[PDB]
Design a protein around this ligand. Structure first.
Ligand code: MFZ
Ligand code: MFZ
Length: 278
């Protein structure tokens, strides 16, 4: 578009490419997401418009602002507020020493605030990963790029549940929390079955006892191997008992037992929370 000048590519996803760009009218630097629209959604755009309006109405300090939506030339441009660094690049830059624990806890706390807000406005992220968590110099972190890495995918999605809940975001955020702490991805699966089996090898193969209804799920197989659960003390050292307890609740198999963002905000782990400068 004539009012935007591309500075550089900053992201790529399934639906489009993301550029740092300058808005010639406001002088502001923005993230520009370009989506090529199929003729099917152009013919029946009502659901797409409803979902994008829900994203646009989100106003929260821990959510990347959707500034403008431009429909032109069989394309949709989403104009977002711009931030300079993502958590994946920050984790990488911090890999010799670790992100300090007060900063891990501040980031976790703020993302839970963002998710509690999304979730109470019937918005799910669906694809949380370090690369779509954006950070600034003031110690803020923000959810971006609302819904190929499988590492953060909730087990109910991998088991073919079509009608999944807000609990999928809590699972992804739990995986990210473990990763900040240990400096290793929790479940680095390279296929859906390897993803599933990595979760099973750590948390135990789920059954009807721990996850009522699991054996009736679309992609559940009786022939899944049966692994015993490991202790969290070997999974996320040196996280303290408050952190381990919180993580265990974020990684409950049953989506209905998994902690909500709002209840996680109240966990004793956040008793000493502060907002450090990275
Ligand atoms: O938010 C204003 C708007 C709009 C749209 C017009 N056509 C669309 C298609 Cl095909 C997809 C998604 C959107 Cl938001 C629009
Ligand atoms: O689609 C993948 C992506 C991305 C983004 C990278 N940087 C961003 C900023 Cl600064 C704002 C908004 C988005 Cl979606 C991205």
């Amino acid at each position: 578009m004539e009012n935007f000048q591309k500075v550089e590519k900053i992201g790529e996803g399934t639906y489009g490419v993301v550029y740092k760009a300058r808005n010639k009218l406001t002088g502001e630097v923005v993230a520009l997401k370009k989506i090529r629209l199929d003729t099917e959604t152009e013919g029946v755009p009502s659901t797409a418009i409803r979902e994008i309006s829900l994203l646009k109405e989100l106003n929260h300090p821990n959510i990347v602002k959707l500034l403008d939506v431009i429909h032109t030339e069989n394309k949709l441009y989403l104009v977002f507020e711009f931030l300079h660094q993502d958590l994946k690049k920050f984790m990488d830059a911090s890999a010799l020493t670790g992100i300090p624990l007060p900063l891990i806890k501040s980031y976790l706390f703020q993302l839970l605030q963002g998710l509690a807000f999304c979730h109470s406005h019937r918005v799910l992220h669906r694809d949380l990963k370090p690369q779509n968590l954006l950070i600034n110099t003031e110690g803020a972190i923000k959810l971006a790029d609302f819904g190929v890495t499988l590492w953060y995918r909730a087990p109910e999605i991998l088991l073919g549940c079509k009608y999944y809940s807000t609990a999928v975001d809590i699972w992804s955020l739990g995986c990210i929390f473990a990763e900040m702490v240990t400096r290793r991805a929790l479940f680095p699966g390279d296929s859906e079955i390897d993803q599933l089996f990595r979760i099973f090898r750590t948390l135990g193969t789920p059954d009807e006892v721990v996850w009522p209804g699991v054996t009736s799920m679309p992609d559940y197989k009786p022939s899944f191997p049966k692994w015993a659960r490991q202790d969290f003390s070997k999974v996320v050292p040196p996280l303290d008992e408050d952190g381990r307890s919180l993580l265990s609740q974020m990684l409950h198999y049953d989506p209905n037992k998994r902690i909500s963002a709002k209840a996680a905000l109240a966990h004793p782990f956040f008793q000493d929370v502060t907002k450090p400068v990275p």
